[PDB]
Amino acid sequence: MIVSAIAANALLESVTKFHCGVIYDYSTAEYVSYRPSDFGAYLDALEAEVARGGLIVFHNGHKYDVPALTKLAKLQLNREFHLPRENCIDTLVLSRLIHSNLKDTDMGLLRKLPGKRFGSHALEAWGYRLGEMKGEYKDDFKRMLEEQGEEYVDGMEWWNFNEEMMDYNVQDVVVTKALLEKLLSDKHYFPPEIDFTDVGYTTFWSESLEAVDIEHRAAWLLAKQERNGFPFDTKAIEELYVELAARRSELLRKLTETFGSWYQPKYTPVEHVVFNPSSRDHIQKKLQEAGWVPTKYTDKGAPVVDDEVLEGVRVDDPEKQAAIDLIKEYLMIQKRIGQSAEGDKAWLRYVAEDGKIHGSVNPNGAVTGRATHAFPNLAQIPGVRSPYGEQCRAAFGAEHHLDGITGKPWVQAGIDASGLELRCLAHFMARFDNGEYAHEILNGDIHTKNQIAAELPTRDNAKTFIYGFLYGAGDEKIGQIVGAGKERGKELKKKFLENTPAIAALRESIQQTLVESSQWVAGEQQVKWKRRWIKGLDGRKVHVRSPHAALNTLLQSAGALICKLWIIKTEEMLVEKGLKHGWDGDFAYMAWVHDEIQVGCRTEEIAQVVIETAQEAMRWVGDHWNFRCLLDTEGKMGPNWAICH
Amino acid sequence: VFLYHIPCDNCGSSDGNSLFSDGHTFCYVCEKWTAMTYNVWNFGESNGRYSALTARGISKETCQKAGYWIAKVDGVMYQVADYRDQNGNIVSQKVRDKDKNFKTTGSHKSDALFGKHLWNGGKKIVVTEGEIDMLTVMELQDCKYPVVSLGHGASAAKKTCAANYEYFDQFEQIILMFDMAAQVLPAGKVRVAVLPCKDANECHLNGHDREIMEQVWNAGPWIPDGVVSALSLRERIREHLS
Amino acid sequence: TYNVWNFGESNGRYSALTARGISKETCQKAGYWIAKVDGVMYQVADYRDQNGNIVSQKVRDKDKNFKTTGSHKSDALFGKHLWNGGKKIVVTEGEIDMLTVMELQDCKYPVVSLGHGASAAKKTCAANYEYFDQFEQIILMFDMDEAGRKAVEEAAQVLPAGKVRVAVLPCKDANECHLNGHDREIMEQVWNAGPWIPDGVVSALSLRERIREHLSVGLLFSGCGINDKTLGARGGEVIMVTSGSGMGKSTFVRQQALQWGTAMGKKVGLAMLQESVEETAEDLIGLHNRVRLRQSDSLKREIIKFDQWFDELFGNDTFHLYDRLLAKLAYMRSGLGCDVIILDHISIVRKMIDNLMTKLKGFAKSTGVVLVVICHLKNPDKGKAHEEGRPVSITDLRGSGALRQLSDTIIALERNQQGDMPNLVLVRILKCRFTGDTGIAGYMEYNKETGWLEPS
RNA sequence: ACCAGC
DNA sequence: TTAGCTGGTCATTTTTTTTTTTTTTTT
Numbered sequence A: 001m002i003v004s005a006i007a008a009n010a011l012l013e014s015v016t017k018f019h020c021g022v023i024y025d026y027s028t029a030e031y032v033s034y035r036p037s038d039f040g041a042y043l044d045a046l047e048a049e050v051a052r053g054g055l056i057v058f059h060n061g062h063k064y065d066v067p068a069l070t071k072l073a074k075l076q077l078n079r080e081f082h083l084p085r086e087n088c089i090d091t092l093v094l095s096r097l098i099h100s101n102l103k104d105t106d107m108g109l110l111r112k113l114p115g116k117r118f119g120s121h122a123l124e125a126w127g128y129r130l131g132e133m134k135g136e137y138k139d140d141f142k143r144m145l146e147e148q149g150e151e152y153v154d155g156m157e158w159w160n161f162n163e164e165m166m167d168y169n170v171q172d173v174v175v176t177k178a179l180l181e182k183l184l185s186d187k188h189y190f191p192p193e194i195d196f197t198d199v200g201y202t203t204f205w206s207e208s209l210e211a212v213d214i215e216h217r218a219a220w221l222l223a224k225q226e227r228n229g230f231p232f233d234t235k236a237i238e239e240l241y242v243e244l245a246a247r248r249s250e251l252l253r254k255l256t257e258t259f260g261s262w263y264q265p266k267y268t269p270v271e272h273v274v275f276n277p278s279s280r281d282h283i284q285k286k287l288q289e290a291g292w293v294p295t296k297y298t299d300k301g302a303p304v305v306d307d308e309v310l311e312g313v314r315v316d317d318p319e320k321q322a323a324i325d326l327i328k329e330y331l332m333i334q335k336r337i338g339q340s341a342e343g344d345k346a347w348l349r350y351v352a353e354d355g356k357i358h359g360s361v362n363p364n365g366a367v368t369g370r371a372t373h374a375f376p377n378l379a380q381i382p383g384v385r386s387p388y389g390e391q392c393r394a395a396f397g398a399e400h401h402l403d404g405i406t407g408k409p410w411v412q413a414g415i416d417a418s419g420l421e422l423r424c425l426a427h428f429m430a431r432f433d434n435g436e437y438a439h440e441i442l443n444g445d446i447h448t449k450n451q452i453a454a455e456l457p458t459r460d461n462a463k464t465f466i467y468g469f470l471y472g473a474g475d476e477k478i479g480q481i482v483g484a485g486k487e488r489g490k491e492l493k494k495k496f497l498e499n500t501p502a503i504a505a506l507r508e509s510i511q512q513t514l515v516e517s518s519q520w521v522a523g524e525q526q527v528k529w530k531r532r533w534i535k536g537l538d539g540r541k542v543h544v545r546s547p548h549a550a551l552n553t554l555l556q557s558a559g560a561l562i563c564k565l566w567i568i569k570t571e572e573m574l575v576e577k578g579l580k581h582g583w584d585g586d587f588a589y590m591a592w593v594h595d596e597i598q599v600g601c602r603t604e605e606i607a608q609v610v611i612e613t614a615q616e617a618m619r620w621v622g623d624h625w626n627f628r629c630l631l632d633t634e635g636k637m638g639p640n641w642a643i644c645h
Numbered sequence B: 001v002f003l004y005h006i007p008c009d010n011c012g013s014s015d016g017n018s019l020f021s022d023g024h025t026f027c028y029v030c031e032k033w034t035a036m037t038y039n040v041w042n043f044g045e046s047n048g049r050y051s052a053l054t055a056r057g058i059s060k061e062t063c064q065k066a067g068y069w070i071a072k073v074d075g076v077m078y079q080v081a082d083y084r085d086q087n088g089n090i091v092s093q094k095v096r097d098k099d100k101n102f103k104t105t106g107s108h109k110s111d112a113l114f115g116k117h118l119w120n121g122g123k124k125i126v127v128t129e130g131e132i133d134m135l136t137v138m139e140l141q142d143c144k145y146p147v148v149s150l151g152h153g154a155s156a157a158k159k160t161c162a163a164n165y166e167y168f169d170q171f172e173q174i175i176l177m178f179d180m181a182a183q184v185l186p187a188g189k190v191r192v193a194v195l196p197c198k199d200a201n202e203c204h205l206n207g208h209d210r211e212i213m214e215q216v217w218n219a220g221p222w223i224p225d226g227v228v229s230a231l232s233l234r235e236r237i238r239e240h241l242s
Numbered sequence C: 001t002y003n004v005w006n007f008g009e010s011n012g013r014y015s016a017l018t019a020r021g022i023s024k025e026t027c028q029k030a031g032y033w034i035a036k037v038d039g040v041m042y043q044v045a046d047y048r049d050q051n052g053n054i055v056s057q058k059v060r061d062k063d064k065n066f067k068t069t070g071s072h073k074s075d076a077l078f079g080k081h082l083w084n085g086g087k088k089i090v091v092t093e094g095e096i097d098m099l100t101v102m103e104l105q106d107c108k109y110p111v112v113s114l115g116h117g118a119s120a121a122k123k124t125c126a127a128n129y130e131y132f133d134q135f136e137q138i139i140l141m142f143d144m145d146e147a148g149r150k151a152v153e154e155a156a157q158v159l160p161a162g163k164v165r166v167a168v169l170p171c172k173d174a175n176e177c178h179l180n181g182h183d184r185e186i187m188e189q190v191w192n193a194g195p196w197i198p199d200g201v202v203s204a205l206s207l208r209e210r211i212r213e214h215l216s217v218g219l220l221f222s223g224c225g226i227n228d229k230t231l232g233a234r235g236g237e238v239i240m241v242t243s244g245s246g247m248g249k250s251t252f253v254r255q256q257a258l259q260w261g262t263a264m265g266k267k268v269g270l271a272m273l274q275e276s277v278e279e280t281a282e283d284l285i286g287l288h289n290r291v292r293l294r295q296s297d298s299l300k301r302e303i304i305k306f307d308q309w310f311d312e313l314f315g316n317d318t319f320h321l322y323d324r325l326l327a328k329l330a331y332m333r334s335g336l337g338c339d340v341i342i343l344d345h346i347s348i349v350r351k352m353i354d355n356l357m358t359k360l361k362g363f364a365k366s367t368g369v370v371l372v373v374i375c376h377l378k379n380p381d382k383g384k385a386h387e388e389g390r391p392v393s394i395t396d397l398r399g400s401g402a403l404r405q406l407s408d409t410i411i412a413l414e415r416n417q418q419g420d421m422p423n424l425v426l427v428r429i430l431k432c433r434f435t436g437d438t439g440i441a442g443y444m445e446y447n448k449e450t451g452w453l454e455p456s
Numbered sequence D: 001a002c003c004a005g006c
Numbered sequence E: 001t002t003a004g005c006t007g008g009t010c011a012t013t014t015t016t017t018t019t020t021t022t023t024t025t026t027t
């Protein structure tokens, strides 16, 4: 087992040059350094450690470091260099599962950290937390150039090689080794009956938990689909921007003549301030002086203003009754513009040269094992029920990738699971009601018949209501779904509690398992805990934030892991079936939002093979962990991500 | 840039106040933000107020971000526009009123541009001839895209645009709004838009502002006058020998 | 500017250069240091005479400005006082290059540098001839630019002969090759270099394979001879056509423009300034169909079948006519993809002609387009004129004399106008850079009925 | 405080 | 006594022509 550290010139998007690299070994204890001219020797050392059957320890190695080596070894000296995924291990993917909760334990330490490093899994932040940090390269280089007198141009100091870079690379691999010893000094994930610094890739993976293996496979696959990208159409979103940027410049002209300006106190100094519809103070004032009473006081002196009170508002003047609808449309158009094209993290500021969007996906960002999406967020674009939704999802298509050998577009397949957490509930409470609840879910659709039984208008409203009732609501927040009062908010709770009297028994079981005493304060809550964590489906200590969200962190943390294994198995069957992953093959993953997957493939027969084998992968997931239910999915085929929603 | 949330101290919230890399905090509940003449006119001396223009249409934040402020000195109304440099310091001023009493104070250079102290990287740029059309484009684009304007008029374009060559070299596409023609800029980069009105404000005040924005993102490349190809000349050869 | 900056009155400190690649020992040996005056740190280099007295400062700031502390002499080299002899020196272009050479040679070789650069190298290398007598070999280390090649070419007259070699570099200069790790290729360029060989001195040893290459085309010309001698036209060449007034320059270049758009199929961009656009197209239509058009009244109205003769030759997008001019020609090269650019008259476009010819030469060097430029001749002071059969010399170029120093080939035409027959021209090649040979190419006749210069 | 997702 | 998990938002210096006289090969 060796511990390697790299340093190159730029990010993985545009990297062309190698600068330095340090290797430490666990059998000779040698800081074997390398130079810019020793890159062949560096690759030979890594290939020797692979060929003898060992493990290479990087940090952030799956996302950046290993494909940087595969790119540099090709485009600098013309040689193929691939590391097998069962040899490379990471110490960031291990940190995101072992220390999954830094924001709730990092206070009391901020005396150590500067303040910008609060809750960071970066390698320098663990240098500050382990009390082993000797300077920083960027600060010392900036201080050096200000001491010489030449300017500091762009914050790009990895242009030229020097000797301080090697020293801070040595300190970097020191911090990586001192992190690895603590991360392997854990006992719940690594049993203390064997030393993990001399075992092979058949002992290290399969003589420990399954959560240490599934997380590395997920990080590998999600880094690969991050490197693939998402095909994007630019002209069809510039047409949308030029369409609805000539609408908010009419909804203000038509509206400031209705709602006039006023003098507001800044001898009494006044200023001529005009009506700004994006503010929620000007609309509150102009509705206060036009004859409207809120009768809803969230704030202690101000009302609440949102889309559910701008519908139930009536005034005397019949012009303002039409003006309020234009105010709501103006707020919608403003949010649409700021998301699509004018924001700091807009869509048109993260399009590469080849017409694709690369978004970072953190596989373990939530406390319940749910992935987060950032820079930009491709799990937050407007759906097909919101206005201007289909015109925003039609640009995010897979038919915008014309093929590089025949000049033809591709086909997209999208696969969604059905009734995921609601069927995990029937898994978990099947030991109470003897499994006569997990038979009605398999007998026809669940949400449609729930809508029939509860006389909700839409299936989406029934689906919102059932999880709102299930994850511990109050008396009003499920009466608000239909708009009625707390009388209906009580009778719906009684109706869906007296049907299956096992949810309260399961909740009492969770309360008797986790909490033992909870003292009551008139403004707070003081609880003596017994077990703050919950064993998940693969032994991972899932952290619990509040004792009334215990059913939540028991259901969604067990629902995310079956999707996380399903996305791995549905390519482990496709590669073994005789296909090729990537753009130069037959299929490519594009995006993984919390439930469904979006894959793009070359022909319709390959689409049919993928949409067949997704079912077999999901059934193998359902058989591997011995669920008491029967898991099932549903797939669609199309050109873009508006039919394949 | 956004980092995380801190608990606020005025409104008492927990996830309302946000911390940033610049050092300032901002709450979203209580909305509290924490931490010639040769005479440059002070903003507080001549009673500088950030007012708006009603008959043409310019919001207050555009005048706050562009440096176009109204003075109430000596009982009259002045519209002072400031010119800045790449370091972010006040260089010169221009005073415009109803009688067009131009008072150019300070060291007015031969390459002065309005709106260059905030915008250095990008792909497109819109170059206009005045100050009202430039603020109109900043109103239509919400003050977030690189738009500059000539501070010397559309008659001396061969001096201001020619002296600024390395500044316009940093961009990929330059789109002009002069007259509805310059060759000192490099080729394959100059685009000229065609408006059905006099300028941008005539399209803004008559409902043609959509045809402003359609000529910003879908402009055409100027093909310099008279370089007519031999194919579109049949009528001028038929009438010549007849 | 004021006085020689002492290190006590300016807080002098000797440090290294991290971002450039120079340690503190090299700047300590040379005398390069940094002062703290007026807040901004100012870097400064020291100049010393032959004795060793402090005579000049060079002050540079973080924004690349120049500040000479006083009277800057011409015999002051950066690195001159430390060495007073040797067998091999290395002449660089700047001051950081000399520090780079001292760093990569462990302070062994006598290495000097220039104090002016590639702009005033002649002034600092002509007056320093008495210093270069005590040396045995000189290795020139200039930039890989156009100005560096101009400096190493124009420095061939003020240096001693038989001792100075020139080295090449793949970087801009030695500093980027020091930063990119090319420390094994600069020593082979210091130890081994190439001799001068200025433009005319070909040794007999260097003909081992050139005679075999001699014992082994481009755009051809129409009408007899010419392409047999100058081997046709190439990319980047500037062809000149000089003749007397009325000798047939426009007809010859129009025939060359017709046969490069109907046979070679290349895009040809015309520019006629002597006439309008409604006449040259009619002349091309009359020239293609073997029947003279603009000199017959009945046939101009008899054919008006005009559209057939129009789209037979203008059916494609081949030709591009024209009715400050360098932007037009740059659009004709880039925005249209033309291969041939013809300029009909240059005198209507001393200092103006030279600047215009340098600008056209830079345009033809950057783009790589076939360029034909037509000018006129002088007025002879004794003898016959150029219209009765006097051979055109290379001296008679109308305007500032430098029309031949920036061209590549010159073709002249002579015919006896007031004589026995005016329809037998003589073509004379005056200068060819590639082939070299000059003289009479061939003989053509005009054939008054048709208009084609057929050979005879 | 608001909006969007799952 | 509390539907939940995330993101994203705002701001003080040498070129052609004319015309008089002294001397030199060549056709």
Ligand SMILES: Cc1cn([C@H]2C[C@H](O)[C@@H](COP(=O)(O)OP(=O)(O)OP(=O)(O)O)O2)c(=O)[nH]c1=O
Pocket (backbone or CB within 6 Å): A416, A417, A418, A419, A420, A421, A422, A463, A464, A467, A595, D006
């Ligand atoms: C809508 C919703 C879902 N969830 C959880 C449970 C859902 O199963 C999962 C994804 O939601 P959905 O995919 O929208 O719902 P579903 O999969 O049960 O139904 P179907 O696919 O047949 O249309 O996330 C919430 O926690 N809160 C919510 O508001």
Ligand SMILES: Cc1cn([C@H]2C[C@H](O)[C@@H](COP(=O)(O)OP(=O)(O)OP(=O)(O)O)O2)c(=O)[nH]c1=O
Pocket (backbone or CB within 6 Å): C244, C245, C246, C247, C248, C249, C250, C251, C252, C274, C376, C415, C422, C423, C424, C425, C445, C446, C448
């Ligand atoms: C060469 C040649 C031309 N001509 C004709 C062709 C033209 O119609 C006319 C004159 O030739 P042109 O080519 O027209 O003369 P030009 O315009 O190039 O001259 P410049 O620009 O210097 O003023 O003479 C003959 O008759 N016999 C010949 O041998």
Ligand SMILES: [Mg+2]
Pocket (backbone or CB within 6 Å): A005, A006, A059, A060, A065
């Ligand atoms: Mg690293």
Ligand SMILES: [Mg+2]
Pocket (backbone or CB within 6 Å): A416, A417, A418, A419, A420, A595
């Ligand atoms: Mg689903």
Ligand SMILES: [Mg+2]
Pocket (backbone or CB within 6 Å): C249, C250, C274
């Ligand atoms: Mg002519």
Ligand SMILES: [Zn+2]
Pocket (backbone or CB within 6 Å): B008, B009, B010, B011, B012, B013, B016, B017, B027, B028, B029, B030, B031, B032
């Ligand atoms: Zn607050």
